Amino acid sequence: HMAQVFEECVSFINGLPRTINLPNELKLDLYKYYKQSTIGNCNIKEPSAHKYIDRKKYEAWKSVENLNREDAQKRYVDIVSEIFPYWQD
């Protein structure tokens, strides 16, 4: 059942008022699990470490290499639930 739960969680995040701002480490965690859930293992070329943020995103994603889709969705959903328990209401 994780796939549909995950889709809804993503929608909830996507819909957040453009006002709410989350800290970067949290955003990165959401990001890496989002990528690992949807695309799977990192599949792009390593960006230059000179492009700081793009590189940080790359390494975050790379760091969850080999986590299957279901565990990645669960981790994404657990992080969101931690901050927004009512997200699926």
Ligand code: NI
């Ligand atoms: Ni199921």
Ligand code: NI
């Ligand atoms: Ni430069």
